[PDB]
Design a protein around this nucleic acid. Structure first.
Ligand code: MG
Ligand code: MG
Ligand code: MG
Ligand code: MG
Ligand code: MG
Ligand code: MG
Ligand code: MG
Ligand code: MG
Ligand code: MG
Ligand code: MG
Ligand code: MG
Ligand code: ZN
Lengths: 155, 86, 225, 104, 43, 129, 60
RNA sequence: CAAACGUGCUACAAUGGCCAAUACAAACAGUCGCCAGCUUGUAAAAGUGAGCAAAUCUGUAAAGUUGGUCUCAGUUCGGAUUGAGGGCUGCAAUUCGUCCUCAUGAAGUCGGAAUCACUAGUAAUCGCGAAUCAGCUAUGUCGCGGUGAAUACGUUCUCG
RNA sequence: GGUACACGAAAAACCUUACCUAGACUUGACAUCCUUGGCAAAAUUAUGGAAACAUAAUGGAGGUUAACCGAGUGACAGGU
């Protein structure tokens, strides 16, 4: 019905690491509209990663997000009611956003202390494909594989 | 609450009646509408008829009620039991 | 649906204020504001057979000036300038003797295209038991022949003494109400009938005034040929 | 030659703007027809007051209309006037709406 | 063992002194003058 | 040959003075260190966004006067002021600066609160039942 | 019981706190504008007729 | 006032609590008013007392930055309730004003079925001002600025 | 119901107040029209008073009655 996609707020330039994705995840962990608070959290957590993994923080972060990154998306269609979850390929732009969004929800629920250590622990746990964000991606992939029959089915 | 410099408050009509009533031995109930007057040391021993809104309820002041307001020792509304709506 | 008052929507853009004064304090801002309502209402309710279209009031720290436009000033003037002195005493009592009054009865031009006397004339016909259709049609045709734009007359109330209230409208021409540049004059009157109250509303269109000024010049007041 | 009044700081304010500009133009024109050095007709910020009032008499507080009232203000300070200018000053006249705050 | 009394009594003494002092100094205002609209100093 | 620029953003003016120098630019905001005036974040660099990709080696001495706004609004104001000052020395820079759109007023200001609403665009909770 | 309340308000009370402000055209007690001594619904008629100088509609 | 619902405020917390230093607004309002500074006071405030009829004088900006502390607990969370002592307005504060200080420290650790608002300087959030008003648990209403997002593939379903 | 429920009410201690209990009044606390005079209403101090209101006081701006202060007087005023 809308039949119009107006300018999608486009911004990418990043300074500390030149990785647009860093700015996106900053905006994801944003709460109460405090830019400085979120910037300190990400940069301090990145600083925490130097003393533990002894590797480049951007490389570990990319290795984590790409590993957390899903492939199939299960949407909603009508059939006598409810929905027989249909797996669809989500575009790349949404794909990174969902990966980043999942990272934040499981990072703000860890038994750890200040989100600095929390998100660092969550991110370090996702570079080895063994964590909480992985399980969600694993679950949606497994849920999608079971319902392959209804896949194609589109309106 | 009430400031210091100001002190207490009585209507001063009660004071003349109270002074007159303490000198007179055969004291009788005082029918007063002034619930704002604070109980002053001289009031002790007298009995008053404070206007609850409808009638004059009798309060006998003692050496202890001194300080509060004369209307505080009487009610204004009454509630003792509800009734099942259903 | 509900519409914004036509006169009130055009204030501060093309139309000036009927009372132009600056008071000293918020206490003198109320007295100088209620008094003029009494004066204006006095003029309009009684002394009506004159067709007073609008009365403006002008006051300074202490000097009150009244500019009264009428169609028949003989009734104000009276017999050899009698009623005029009489009306003057009323005004002085209302504001106070300590001031100076300066009545300035001015004859009006183009009497037709003024929503006040037209509404008053419409309202007068209804108290005299004149049939509504005939009264409205006759007033419109004289008004249309007088040479103005469209007129819209709405007369809501217990029409013709009925027990169920109705409303009758009669548009005749282009009356762009949503437009600000138009010169639309609006007035409202209460016809007091034996069966209740009748509300008559008259919208009159007097051309297009691209002028960005607020009055600053006679509107229908101007006397053309 | 004399002065008798140094630094006449006339201040103008009115509910209307165009009348205020017109009145400032007339004063300035007259004061330069006599031998006075006008500093300049500068504008001051206009104090605007706004009152919010529910239109209906009884219900529907959500639907509330609004009003504003601007008191346009101007400043003008005259250096030296003298009697030669005082006469024009007197017979200058000012449309009611405009308000003067002469502070001598 | 004063049991109230003394302290509240002093407050009562202050109040009774206040009540007997009462002087009808009824008034309504504060600052005064400087209330005008100026003119053309004679027009 | 000095250069002057007047930027604005979120009700915050700016007077940026560009002075030619060859002894390090030494950026300065209201006679105080920018690292002391503004937050220690990319905003301090956001101000260098048009001065980095072209150059700052020409060592332009910066004389910033901003009066109004918060700190992000002030940063946007000096950016617009700096870019407007940059439009007086060597007009090609304009072209490349135009590309990234860093020479246009953002036109974004806080909206007016509306009656019956809890804010610019919010609205009360609706209860049907 | 309106006119008597209006008349009593005009008359001075025996205590200063006993004095309230009513609308001067009608007798409405609540929603009275002290800036004008006129209630909120009398202000519409005066504002919509031009009786009050300077009162124009607002656009922001 | 045995109860039920609607709209808001405060929270259940280390994106934080407490302490210290400190940077950056717009709009509006003000002579029975704004009240600077000074003195007293743990504080609300009192006294003195200029300045401002106002782009002049007054109405402390807070979130934000840095440092210290708290170490996940029904707590240095959370403030209810209750007792006492003060301050202001007012003839008058018990029914039924609010503020400060001390004392206590309910529930509540993210809230069932079901629902509401919002498409940029918007949602969220932090302060400021005005109206009625002697004073007012207006946390309401009307305004002003500081920081400041996420998403829209599509009309198959849903409401109009 | 949507289109009522931080709505009328942009401020309920007194006042507001329209409600109840009481103490008081009757062309009335407010108004006109009529026969008729103005040589006041206030405010405040006394006494009795919960306060209304009474009995005594300075007898009051002014302008000769202008406005109002009254008498007489029935049409009537009045009702949130
Ligand atoms: Mg009535
Ligand atoms: Mg009051
Ligand atoms: Mg200065
Ligand atoms: Mg201070
Ligand atoms: Mg706490
Ligand atoms: Mg109390
Ligand atoms: Mg839209
Ligand atoms: Mg309805
Ligand atoms: Mg009451
Ligand atoms: Mg006499
Ligand atoms: Mg006589
Ligand atoms: Zn009114």
């Amino acid at each position: 019905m809308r039949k119009n996609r107006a300018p999608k707020r486009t911004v990418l330039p990043d300074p500390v690491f030149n990785n647009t994705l860093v700015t996106r995840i900053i905006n994801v962990i944003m709460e109460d509209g405090k830019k400085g608070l979120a910037q300190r959290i990400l940069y301090g957590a990145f600083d925490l990663i130097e003393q533990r993994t002894k590797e480049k923080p951007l490389t570990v972060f990319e290795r984590a997000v790409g590993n957390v990154m899903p492939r199939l998306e299960l949407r909603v269609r009508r059939i006598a009611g409810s929905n027989y979850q249909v797996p669809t390929e989500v575009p790349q732009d949404r794909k990174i956003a969902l990966a980043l969004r999942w990272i934040a929800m499981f990072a703000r629920k860890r038994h750890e202390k200040t989100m600095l250590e929390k998100i660092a622990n969550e991110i370090i746990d996702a570079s080895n494909n063994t964590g909480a964000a992985i399980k969600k991606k694993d679950d949606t992939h497994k849920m999608a594989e079971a319902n392959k029959a209804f896949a194609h089915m589109r309106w | 609450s009430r400031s210091a410099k100001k002190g207490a408050f009585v209507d001063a009509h009660l004071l003349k009646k109270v002074i007159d009533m303490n000198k007179q031995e055969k004291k009788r109930p005082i029918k007063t509408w002034s619930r704002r007057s604070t109980i002053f040391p001289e009031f002790v021993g007298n009995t008053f008829a404070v206007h609850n809104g409808k009638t004059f309820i009798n309060v006998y002041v003692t050496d202890d009620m001194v300080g509060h307001k004369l209307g505080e020792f009487s009610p204004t509304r009454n509630f003792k039991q509800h009734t099942a709506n259903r | 649906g509900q519409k914004v008052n036509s006169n009130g929507l055009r204030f501060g853009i093309n139309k000036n204020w009927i009372s132009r004064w600056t008071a000293n304090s918020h206490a003198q801002t109320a007295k100088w504001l209620i008094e003029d309502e009494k004066i204006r209402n006095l003029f309009f309710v009684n002394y009506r057979n004159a067709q007073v279209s609008n009365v403006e009031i002008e006051r300074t720290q202490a000097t009150v000036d009244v500019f009264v436009y009428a169609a028949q000033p003989a009734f104000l003037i009276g017999s050899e300038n009698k009623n005029i002195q009489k009306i003057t005493k009323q005004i002085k009592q209302i504001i106070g003797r300590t001031t100076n009054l300066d009545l300035t009865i001015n004859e009006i031009g183009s009497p037709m295209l003024s929503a006040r006397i037209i509404a008053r004339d419409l309202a007068n016909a209804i108290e005299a038991r004149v049939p509504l259709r005939t009264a409205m049609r006759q007033s419109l045709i004289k008004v249309l022949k007088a040479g103005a734009n469209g007129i819209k007359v709405l007369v809501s109330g217990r029409l013709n003494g009925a027990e169920i209230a109705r409303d009758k409208m009669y548009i005749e021409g282009n009356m762009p109400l949503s437009t600000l540049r138009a010169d639309i004059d609006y007035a409202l009157e209460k016809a007091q009938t034996t069966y209740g109250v009748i509300g008559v509303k008259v919208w009159i269109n007097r051309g297009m005034i691209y002028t960005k000024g607020l009055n600053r010049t006679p509107a229908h007041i101007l006397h053309p040929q | 030659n004399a002065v008798k009044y140094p630094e006449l700081k006339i201040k103008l304010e009115s509910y209307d703007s165009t009348l205020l500009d017109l009145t400032t133009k007339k004063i300035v024109e007259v004061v330069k027809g006599v031998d006075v050095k006008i500093k300049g007709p500068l504008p001051l910020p206009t104090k605007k007051e706004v009152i919010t009032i529910i239109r209906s008499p009884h219900v529907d507080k959500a639907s509330r209309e609004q009003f504003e009232k601007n008191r346009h203000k101007r400043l003008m300070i005259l250096v030296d006037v003298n009697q030669g200018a005082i006469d024009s000053l007197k017979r200058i006249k000012i449309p009611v709406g405009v308000t003067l705050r002469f502070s001598k | 063992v004063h049991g109230r009394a003394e302290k509240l009594s002093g407050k009562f003494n202050a109040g009774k002194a206040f009540l007997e002092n009462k002087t009808p100094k009824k008034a309504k205002g504060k600052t005064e003058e400087y209330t005008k609209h100026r003119s053309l100093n004679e027009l | 040959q000095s250069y002057y620029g007047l930027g604005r953003r979120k009700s915050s003016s700016a007077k940026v003075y560009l002075t030619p120098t060859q002894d390090k630019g030494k950026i300065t905001v209201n006679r105080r260190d920018p690292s002391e005036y503004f937050p220690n974040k990319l905003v301090i660099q956001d101000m260098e966004q048009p001065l980095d990709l072209t150059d700052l080696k020409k060592n332009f001495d910066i004389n910033v006067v901003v009066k109004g706004g918060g700190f992000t609004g002030q940063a946007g104001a000096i950016r617009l002021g700096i870019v407007r000052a940059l439009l007086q020395f060597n007009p090609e820079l304009k072209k490349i600066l135009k590309s990234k759109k860093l020479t246009t007023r953002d036109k974004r200001v806080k909206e007016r609160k509306k009656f019956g609403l809890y804010g610019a665009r919010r609205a009360p909770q609706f209860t049907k039942r | 019981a309106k006119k008597s309340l209006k008349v009593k308000q005009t008359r001075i009370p025996k205590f200063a706190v006993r004095a309230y402000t009513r609308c001067q055209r009608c007798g409405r007690a609540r929603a009275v504008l002290s800036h004008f001594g006129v209630c909120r619904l009398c202000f519409r008629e005066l504002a919509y007729a031009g009786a009050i100088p300077g009162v124009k509609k607002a656009s922001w």
